[PDB]
Each structure stands twice: as structure tokens, then as C-alpha cells.
Assembly symmetry: C3
Homo-oligomer: 125 residues x 3
Amino acid sequence: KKILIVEDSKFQAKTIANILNKYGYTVEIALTGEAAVEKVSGGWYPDLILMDIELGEGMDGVQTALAIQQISELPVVFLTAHTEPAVVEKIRSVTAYGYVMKSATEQVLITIVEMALRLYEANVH
Amino acid sequence: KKILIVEDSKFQAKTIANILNKYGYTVEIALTGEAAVEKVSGGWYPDLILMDIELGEGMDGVQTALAIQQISELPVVFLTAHTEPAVVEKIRSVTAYGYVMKSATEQVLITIVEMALRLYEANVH
Amino acid sequence: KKILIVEDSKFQAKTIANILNKYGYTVEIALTGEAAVEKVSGGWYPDLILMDIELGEGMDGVQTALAIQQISELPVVFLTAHTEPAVVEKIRSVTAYGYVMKSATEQVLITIVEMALRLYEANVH
Ligand SMILES: [Cl-]
Ligand SMILES: [Cl-]
Ligand SMILES: [Cl-]
Ligand code: NA
């Protein structure tokens, strides 16, 4: 199973990657939404995307998710830095499998990943 | 996707409705279980019910869920006000998709809603 | 629905069993992984296993899960005592449906159980 982590902070991205590797996932990191779209449109399809909602100066996570979902129906779980995130109205067009705080425990993060992976297979069926 | 919120406190119901609207859901509120049963038996079927366990002076949430589940297999997620809720023995007959604290974060609430919605399609298949 | 709880502490196992009984589950407890494997290989198949990661002096929970998964594809949710558990590299070979802290609320525990039960049916389909 391949996970793409899309996150403006390399430190946060690496912190999550290390957690995921501990459970047997191979992980790629994109530090902008544009990089993520390029990777997936270039032909590398992950089994799941962990997407920072805000991102940086470029496209935000909701835009990135909506772009990727035109390429392929892949499950997206959003990462949040705030208890109540700025979610743009466009979220209505994105299929989200979950939202998790970047400060959440390993148990909460891996559970959401594992459940999203199974829910995806059930619907993609 | 249509969500029915069944909750004795209009303030709590509206607080949850606002959160759900932010993510693109259209929401209806019933302030008694009897109102909820009337709405659904009247022919309006939600994609998911968020059900207060206690409710008020009328039927409780477990009774309401059991009544609705005779009308249609709709997913119910229970709302709780207590860390360890009074759950009547009848809970054994109700198909629950989740339990969430009314004091839970947006992330926990929306994740449970999104997962219940997908798990429902997978089983209703 | 039959749940097997595999846990080194009888006190913890009983505490979880009581919570599960409150929601209508019949529960069996194994206090070693060896006992669990004997029960399942002996012909008693649970609908779900709640598995302590560490266990005691015998086989650990990851080993127990990997052994059981050779007998039957049953959903395993791991119980953890630590915020960041010692997870052996072998976890890569185990299908996990979730991880939950033994100190977690009733709501978090029952939600994970209920969702794992439905995700299992969706995939086992
Ligand atoms: Cl990058
Ligand atoms: Cl009403
Ligand atoms: Cl035993
Ligand atoms: Na089918």
C-alpha cells in the first residue's frame, strides 16, 4: 500500500511518514499540491492521500483533492492544524474519508488510515 | 446527502447543523423522537440520523432508532452527553454505526459521519 | 456477534467485557495468545478480536494475530497501553482494523468495534 502525504511542513510530513513506515506502509511526500497533482497525473497512483487542508502559497488541500479526484477516485483523508479549520465551500465537491488533527495520537491516525483503505475497497468494488 | 439531527436542545442541534452545513450537508432538525418518526414515516428518508441518546420527556433515542429501523434501514450515529451513557438493554436490537460525544471536535464528528455514510453504502449494496 | 478479548490483565479484559455486554455483545476472554489460538483453532470463531499488543511472557499480540489470520480472516482491533506502542516489524503482515487505547472512552471503543464489524462484512463479501 502506497500513501502520499501532502504537507507544507517537511517536518510534519516526515513525522507522519515515520509513523506510517512503522506499520508497513511505503510513503511518498509532496510539499505542494502542485507537486502532488504532477506526481499522480504523471502516472503514480497512491492507495490513499493524507492532505494538509491549508498547504502554503500555492493551491490549498481542497483544490488539490478536487484536481486529483478528476484523475482518479482515490481516498483522501485531510490533515488539520486547527480545531476548527478554514474549509472552503468547495469541500462540498470533494469525497473525504476523514479528518485528523496533525497533533493526534498514532492510534487515531493509523486507525483512520486503515479504515479509509478498507472503506475504499468496499465502495470501489 | 440529507442528515436528520434528533436532539432535545435546539442549541446543540443548531450547533451540529452549522458544522454539517460547513461540509456541504443539508440538515433537518427534529426536537423529539416522535417528530423524527413522523418525518421519516411521512416519507422523508435521510441518508443518516444523528440521534441524542437521552432526548427529553418523550421516547428516548434508542426507542426512536428502533422505530425508524422498522421503517427503513438508515444508519444511526448516537450523540452522547455523558462519558458513560445510560444505554437501555434495547440497544441490543438497534444497528448503530457510531457514538460521538456532543463535546467532540469537528474532526471527530465529521469523520464519523463520512465513514458511516460509506459503510452504509457498502452494506446496503 | 461474538467478541474475543485477548489481554494479559484479567481486570482490563473484564472491564472491556462489561462495556461490550452493555451494548449487546457476548464476549469471551483469553488471557494469553496461546489460549486464543487454541480457542479459535479448536473451532470457535469470533466475529472480532480485541487484541492487547504486548500480552505477557508468551506470544505477543502481533504474533497471535498473524497465527489466527492463518486460520481465518477475522477482524483484529489492537488494544494499546502506550501512546506510542512497540510494534514489531511483523505488523506489516497483519490485517488490522484499528488501534485503540485501553484508557479510551466507551464511545471511541464501541465505535471502533461497530465500524470494524461492518467493514469486515463489506470486504468479506
Ligand atoms: Cl515536493
Ligand atoms: Cl421538531
Ligand atoms: Cl485464558
Ligand atoms: Na457485489
